[PDB]
């Protein structure tokens, strides 16, 4: 969230994905561990429509993993 160049890059990512005729047939998948860091810019519902939480694996989930 708000160097200066990293900001520029992420602004470019924001508008090549949400503004002025996006989509056609390009789908993006985003992965991170620090969602609290990103807050206002990317996490907009228009930009990343789905927010899929990966929980601490469950008992049966842990057994399946092993």
């Amino acid at each position: 969230k708000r160097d200066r160049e990293v900001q520029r890059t992420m602004l470019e990512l924001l508008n090549q994905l949400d503004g002025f005729q996006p989509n056609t047939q390009v789908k993006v998948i985003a992965a991170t561990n620090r969602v609290d860091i990103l807050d206002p810019a990317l996490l907009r519902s228009g930009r990343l429509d789905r927010k899929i939480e990966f929980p601490m694996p469950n008992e049966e989930a842990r057994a399946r993993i092993m």
Binding site: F20, D36, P40, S45, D49
Partner: protein, 368 residues
């Protein structure tokens, strides 16, 4: 007897048609071989004329020379700032070209903005009216402005929370006005070459002046309009100077869009550059209902839809949030293999997008 005559006559006609085609490719071959003999000419902008014959030309990014007009070209039209072509042997001026488009600027003009109308955008009637009064009326109807004497506002900047529709509003204005529209992400104008961004924006404004009635739109202006890395400030100075160059007659207008208006340098915030400010706040209750109706219009629902209960639950939602609500209702339907959508899908979608907004730890946002 007529069958043999028809055979030979049709063969003759086909042979002559193929011969016309063959002569056509022969002429094409001669034309492109004659073209092959052609030699390119060095382009460059011009400077002070010393006499009626000797001029100063700044050959592209290369060095400047003292050259002359060929023999027949005009002399009065060659003023400092005319794109001219130069021979690569004696460097004289021939075929002075009109001006360069800077093909990037070609891309930012002929880029599809969508078929969005004022109907598709909802909840910002005040903002739509203000923007159309600031950018549409001065353009389409100038005579009011010149007779009355009002200097039309040079441009307007749009600020608000993410997903409120500033970019959508700009798209609608672009799509509905039959004009020349310019849109470019600010981050893209910055280039790693020395001073390339200032020349970029200079050429953009030159194209806008050339191609009136022209409209230039800025999205995420805070990329370069931020408070005072070096090239950002150098190009911001060029932005201020160039858009201070707007003469009253010009039918060109400015729209800047941003999500953090505070970071913007107060230099633009001064009157005389960026006078009218428009706030697109989070959609209100009736605004949320209108946006929801617009987005859920084309979907194939069955039965009554209680938009009012949704708007009751959808506190703090933005337009993109409501679009996500519609999408997630559709996805609940698609997973449940319903050819239609029901109120329960919308309910589930509202709750899901609410949990998504829980992630949206949006920091409080403050105007300019």
């Amino acid at each position: 007897k007529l069958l043999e005559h028809k055979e030979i006559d049709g063969r003759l006609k086909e042979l002559r048609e193929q011969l016309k085609e063959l002569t056509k490719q022969y002429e094409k071959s001669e034309n492109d071989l004659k073209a092959l003999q052609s030699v390119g000419q060095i382009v460059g902008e011009v400077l002070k004329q010393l006499t009626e014959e000797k001029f100063i030309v700044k050959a592209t990014n290369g060095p400047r020379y003292v050259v002359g007009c060929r023999r027949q070209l005009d002399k009065s039209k060659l003023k400092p700032g005319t794109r001219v072509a130069l021979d690569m042997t004696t460097l004289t001026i021939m075929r002075y070209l009109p001006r360069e488009v800077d093909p990037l600027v070609y891309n930012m003009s002929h880029e599809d903005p969508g078929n969005v109308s004022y109907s598709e955008i909802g909840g910002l009637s005040e903002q739509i009216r203000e923007l159309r009064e600031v950018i549409e009326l001065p353009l389409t109807n100038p005579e009011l402005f010149q007779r009355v004497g009002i200097i039309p506002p040079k441009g307007c900047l749009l600020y608000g929370p993410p997903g409120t529709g500033k970019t959508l509003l700009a798209r609608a204005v672009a799509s509905q006005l039959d004009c020349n529209f310019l849109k470019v992400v600010s981050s893209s104008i910055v280039d790693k070459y020395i001073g390339e961004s200032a020349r970029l924006i200079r050429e953009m404004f030159n194209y806008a002046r050339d191609h009136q009635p022209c409209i230039i739109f800025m999205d995420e202006i805070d990329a370069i309009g931020g408070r005072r890395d070096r090239e950002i400030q150098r190009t911001l100075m060029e932005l201020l100077n160039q858009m201070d160059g707007f003469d009253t007659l010009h039918r060109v207008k400015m729209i800047m869009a941003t999500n953090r208006p505070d970071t913007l340098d107060p230099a633009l915030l001064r009157p005389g550059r960026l006078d009218r400010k428009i706030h697109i706040d989070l959609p209100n209750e009736q605004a949320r209902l209108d946006i929801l109706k617009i987005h859920a219009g084309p979907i194939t629902k069955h039965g009554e839809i209680d938009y009012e209960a949704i708007v009751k639950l959808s506190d703090g939602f933005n337009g993109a949030d409501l679009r996500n609500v519609c999408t997630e209702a559709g996805m609940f339907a698609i997973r449940a293999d319903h050819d239609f959508v029901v109120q329960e899908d919308f309910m589930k979608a509202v709750r899901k997008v609410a949990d998504s907004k829980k992630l949206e730890s949006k920091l409080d946002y403050k105007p300019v």
